[PDB]
């Protein structure tokens, strides 16, 4: 049966990997949160595998197991980083829920009724570790997620580690795919159980896992219809409105049709998250703290000649632009919706 | 009661006018078709009345009773026109229904499932009169509507009549309102009972009644929501989808909120139909043939500085442009609807 064969292919991140030296199962199923939708495995490949090159070229996710991208950073923990990462400020988000929904603070002026479920506090790295240690022994419920672009202020040893990254491999990827510049490296340090809810980014991403394990659930650009992003002028622009823990099928009926691609990344793994791909990222339950460094690249420019039919990501680009232009032309972002509704009701729906 | 006072103001075209020399009621109520919505009178004013100038300036409909705009054309009938209008071709529409819905023949390639309820035949003027006489004595059901832009081929007497139009008055209106050029004069010769269903035009219109009586029902640009025009790429672009004789309230719920401005124009009356105003025009039942000449002017250009909030007609302009741009960008007009729906569903509605 195609139905039974479908349930076989819906195998998620699959059989948990065995760590070298018989050091036991890396992780187990009970560490994964439970969701309402099926998932297919993201290919886990060698960088020298021609299939991997083909997937990156076609802008499809692949986990590369042996890039050595952040090889020198594999020795990073809280102690090493507190000693070496400098006296700069670090953005630390704090929430009472496990979900850390990103919000654009520049867009909060348009949406005054929006109240953020997380707070951003700028602190020193030793303060983050102190606040982390504080919650751990107090048995508190507060969750933290350090999310900071790595800058000038990092110390000499972090700079040295940075130099030891596999720039050869990634410079060639940037070159071959026609991408623009590297815009940032985001350091992510999360607590066990922390969730970054489904969203897409407008940049190409090499997601380099350093410490702990992250389950990454991805959705293709053509599933825009199933994922219901906030309006473009909303602070949560690019993020799904659907609560994955309790999906509102009345408001979001096509979420019943959503199908993910998932994997669990650990130390040394690099996940290619293609531009415009939805991703939901969770630090495994009871897995300890996680560390990731991403590499964000501006996408390749719009091709000289347009080909038809359009790709899913091009239609997303289009919809975004329609929303922006309408916001500007109407002089008020709040007016976009009423105009769009007026445009389709009894005309296109 | 405001409800009773509302039913008083909803007086339609009002008390039928008395023709000079006690020649009886110009028309009576039984000649008007019955519709589901209320209507308010369009002001019927002298051209020298300051209110009339104010209404045209504010782009609101007004009937001017004494312009003398087409004074020399008041002697026009079928015999006089057949004798003088030339050997040129005339577009004659033919229908089995009373409704003459305009269709863009250039847009019919996008919409192959669209079948026109009327047919265009090019003929000579004597052929139109012959075909008209043919149906009249045969007791047929076929309806004709001559609709032809007046051109080079008109004879000397029609040219002479044209010269005697009140160009002074209308040139000053064109000048004062900042309008563009006169683009055409449409001759309309319809049979009693003929209906032009609700639509708007993208030009300013002075609608000069010559023979017989027409009931004109107008709706302001802000009633776009109640009138449900076809998609912009549809042959019936700018026309209401609502069948006024049998309105589909399931498909078109806000048609229950529609409120018109109506008048009956006769020989010598000029109705200003402002650009973007919906108009439904019907030749009175058992009123004989009707003759009208319109004057179509390109609207005044987009002002240098934009003012907020936007006017209703500007939002209409905007919606039209969004539909056009999407048609072009997607490479296929049929794709506009699916993209628009995807954009709003569970996001803006």
């Amino acid at each position: 049966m195609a139905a039974t064969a479908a349930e076989a292919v819906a195998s998620g991140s699959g059989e948990p990997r065995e760590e070298a030296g018989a050091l036991g199962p890396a992780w187990d199923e009970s560490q994964l949160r439970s969701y309402s939708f099926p998932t297919r495995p993201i290919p886990r490949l060698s960088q020298s595998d021609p299939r991997a090159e083909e997937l990156i070229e076609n802008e499809e996710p692949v986990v590369l197991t042996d890039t050595n991208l952040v090889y020198p950073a594999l020795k990073w923990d809280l102690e090493y980083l507190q000693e070496n990462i400098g006296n700069g400020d670090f953005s630390v988000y704090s929430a009472s829920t496990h979900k850390f929904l990103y919000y654009d603070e520049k867009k909060m002026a348009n949406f005054q009724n929006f109240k953020p479920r997380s707070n951003r506090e700028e602190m020193k790295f030793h303060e983050f570790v102190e606040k982390l240690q504080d919650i751990q022994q107090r048995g508190g419920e507060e969750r933290l997620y350090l999310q900071q672009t790595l800058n000038d202020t990092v110390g000499r040893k972090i700079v040295m580690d940075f130099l030891g990254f596999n720039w050869n491999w990634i410079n060639k990827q940037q070159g071959k795919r026609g991408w623009g510049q590297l815009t940032s490296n985001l350091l992510l340090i999360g607590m066990e159980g922390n969730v970054t809810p489904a969203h897409y980014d407008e940049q190409q991403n090499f997601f380099a896992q350093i410490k702990g394990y992250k389950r990454c659930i991805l959705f293709p650009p053509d599933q825009f219809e199933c994922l219901y992003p906030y309006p473009v002028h909303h602070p949560c622009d690019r993020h799904s409105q659907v609560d994955f823990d309790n999906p509102d099928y009345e408001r979001f009926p096509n979420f019943q049709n959503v199908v993910g691609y998932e994997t669990v990344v650990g130390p040394g793994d690099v996940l290619y998250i293609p531009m415009y791909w939805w991703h939901h990222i969770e630090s495994l339950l009871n897995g300890g703290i996680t560390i990731t460094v991403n590499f964000w690249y501006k996408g390749a420019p719009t091709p000289k000649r347009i080909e038809y039919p359009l790709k899913a990501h091009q239609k997303v680009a289009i919809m975004r632009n329609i929303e922006k232009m309408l916001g500007e032309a109407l002089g008020n972002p709040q007016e976009v919706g009423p105009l769009l509704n007026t445009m389709i009701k009894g005309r296109y729906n | 009661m405001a409800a009773t006072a509302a039913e008083a103001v909803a007086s339609g075209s009002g008390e039928p006018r008395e023709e000079a020399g006690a020649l009886g009621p110009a028309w009576d109520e039984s000649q008007l078709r019955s519709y589901s919505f209320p209507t308010r009178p369009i002001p019927r004013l002298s051209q020298s009345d300051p209110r009339a100038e104010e209404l045209i300036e504010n782009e609101e409909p007004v009937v001017l009773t004494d312009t003398n705009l087409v004074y020399p054309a008041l002697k026009w009938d079928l015999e006089y026109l057949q004798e003088n209008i030339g050997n040129g071709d005339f577009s004659v529409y033919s229908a089995s229904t009373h409704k003459f819905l305009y269709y863009d023949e250039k847009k019919m390639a996008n919409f192959q499932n669209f079948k026109p309820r009327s047919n265009r035949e090019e003929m000579k003027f004597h052929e139109f009169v012959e075909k008209l006489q043919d149906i009249q004595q045969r007791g047929g059901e076929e309806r004709l509507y001559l609709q032809q832009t007046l051109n080079d081929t008109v004879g000397r007497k029609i040219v002479m009549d044209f010269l005697g139009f009140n160009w002074n008055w209308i040139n000053k209106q064109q000048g004062k309102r900042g309008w563009g050029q006169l683009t055409s004069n449409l001759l309309l010769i319809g049979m009693e009972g003929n209906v032009t269903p609700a639509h708007y035009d993208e030009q300013q219109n002075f609608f000069a009644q010559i023979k017989g009586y027409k009931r004109c029902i107008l709706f302001p640009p802000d009633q776009f929501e109640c009138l449900y025009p076809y998609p912009v790429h549809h042959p019936c672009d700018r026309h209401s989808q609502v069948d006024f004789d049998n309105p589909d309230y399931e498909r078109f719920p806000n048609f229950q909120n529609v409120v018109g401005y109506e008048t009956v124009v006769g020989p010598g009356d000029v109705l200003y139909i402002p650009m973007y105003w919906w108009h439904h025009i019907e030749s009175l039942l058992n009123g004989g043939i009707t003759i009208t000449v319109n004057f179509w002017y390109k609207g005044a250009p987009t002002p240098k500085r934009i003012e907020y909030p936007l006017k209703a007609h500007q939002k209409v302009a905007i919606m039209r442009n969004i539909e056009k741009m999407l048609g072009e960008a997607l490479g296929n007009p049929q794709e506009v609807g699916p993209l628009l729906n995807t954009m709003i569903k569970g996001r803006y509605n």
């Binding site: 990103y102 969203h199 980014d201 680009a317 | -």
Partner: peptide, 18 residues
């Protein structure tokens, strides 16, 4: 070049005032 205007993209990512 309306098509090109509609196909253009920004560089927005989850990082504050970037």
């Amino acid at each position: 070049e309306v098509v090109k205007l509609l196909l253009e993209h920004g560089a927005d990512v989850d990082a504050q005032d970037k």
